[PDB]
């Protein structure tokens, strides 16, 4: 894999060259599908290597959900240095994988025939996506994972072709996804920034480093936060707020070029607070009107090979909508709330308007990139500030 465009220029893409995506070299000046919709779809699953079998995972079965939890906990995305690994909780996986419209055949597992061990996974969820001047029903692809012992045997192309086939059967021909690797061809390139909330732990586990010109005591003062948020009328989102949160989000997202189009039921699913999964706080003003909201989701990482610290508690910026409260003040309060809730670090991308507050709120730039991709859709690339889509 290539994590920089430089390394990707020298690479050859034996699988992705076969797929309806633009080539890494060319510039795109068109808008539309790479190839027309297929009107006959392969009925049979693609063939796996001998000894492995497809199994659709019923995540409503607690035992099967735990198997998926364990596959990802042991084999999912690590940082560049193999020090941290995502640790999606079972309840988070239910949130991410059973939104409105979820389908069981889109929870696509691979098992060893003899032992029944779960060794592979890929998922699709439906989403309406606004890309420039087009709204398209698409899927979001997530949680592609191959067991470490199965790596480099080209199982991932089979997983991708099989989820593609299963999505084609439902009449959907475009997809959106992110990756830390460079593939043909990014529609936008984003970067994670990190806001330290627990500097001592972050430095101990080498998530962050102590600046050579700074001492620990000074570093802890640099990152100290108020005990309580400052914005008048900030409170957790409630059921009665679902319509106005939907309204605020829909109007706020029109300014970006890659965004979700959420129904009111989807807004309920993605924003209604669930402890240790998703937090949403609204600003209810002196007239009783909701004018702003902030949100962040919970995604810890395993700290590998460490005798004392085992997990890094991380909050991820989700969607933050401002119409009367300054975005800077909203995000300051998100930091205070995350600190109150025990998070070690607050993460945010440089997309939407986030660059307006990242440096001011003492975020530090992270390593690597988060590339955004469309499958079977040709359009010009865009700057990070025009990406208005956040995936789990």
């Amino acid at each position: 894999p290539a994590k920089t465009m430089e390394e990707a220029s020298k690479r050859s893409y034996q699988f992705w060259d076969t797929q309806p995506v633009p080539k890494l070299g060319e510039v795109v000046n068109t808008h539309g599908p790479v190839e027309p919709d297929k009107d006959n779809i392969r009925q049979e699953p693609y063939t796996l290597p001998q000894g492995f079998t497809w199994d659709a995972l019923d995540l409503g079965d607690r035992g099967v959900l735990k198997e998926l939890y364990t596959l990802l906990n042991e084999n999912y995305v690590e940082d560049d240095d193999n020090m941290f690994r995502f640790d999606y909780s079972p309840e988070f996986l239910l949130w991410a994988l059973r939104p409105p419209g979820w389908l069981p055949q889109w929870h696509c597992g691979v098992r060893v025939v003899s032992s029944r061990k779960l060794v592979g996974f890929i998922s699709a969820i439906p989403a309406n996506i606004h890309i420039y001047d087009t709204e398209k029903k698409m899927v979001e692809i997530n949680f592609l994972c191959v067991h470490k012992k199965l790596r480099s045997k080209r199982v991932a192309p089979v997983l991708i072709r099989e989820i593609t086939r299963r999505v084609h059967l439902e009449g959907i021909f475009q997809a959106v996804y992110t990756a830390g690797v460079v593939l043909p061809k990014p529609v936008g390139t984003c970067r994670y920034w990190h806001r330290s909330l627990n500097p001592r732990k972050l430095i101990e586990v080498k998530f962050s480093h102590l600046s050579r010109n700074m001492t620990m005591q000074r570093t802890m003062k640099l990152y100290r936060l108020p005990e309580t948020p400052k914005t008048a009328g900030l409170r957790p989102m409630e059921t009665k707020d679902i319509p106005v949160v939907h309204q605020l989000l829909t109007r706020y997202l029109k300014q970006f070029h890659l965004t979700p189009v959420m129904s009111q039921e989807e807004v309920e699913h993605w924003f209604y607070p669930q402890e240790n999964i998703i937090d949403t706080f609204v600003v209810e003003n002196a007239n009783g009107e909701v004018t702003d909201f902030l949100s962040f989701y919970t995604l810890p990482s395993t700290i590998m090979n460490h005798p004392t610290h085992k997990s890094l508690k991380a909050a991820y910026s989700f969607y933050n909508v401002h119409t009367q409260t300054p975005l800077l003040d909203l995000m300051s309060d998100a930091l205070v709330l995350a600190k109150m809730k025990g998070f070690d670090v607050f993460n945010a991308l440089d997309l939407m308007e986030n660059k307006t507050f990242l440096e001011k709120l003492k975020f530090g730039i992270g390593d690597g990139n988060l590339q955004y991709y469309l499958y079977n859709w040709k359009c010009p690339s865009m700057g990070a500030e025009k990406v208005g889509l956040v995936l789990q």
Binding site: G180, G364, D367, L370, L391
Partner: peptide, 8 residues
Amino acid sequence: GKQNSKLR
């Protein structure tokens, strides 16, 4: 499909 980032 996320990327695991830490501080540069």
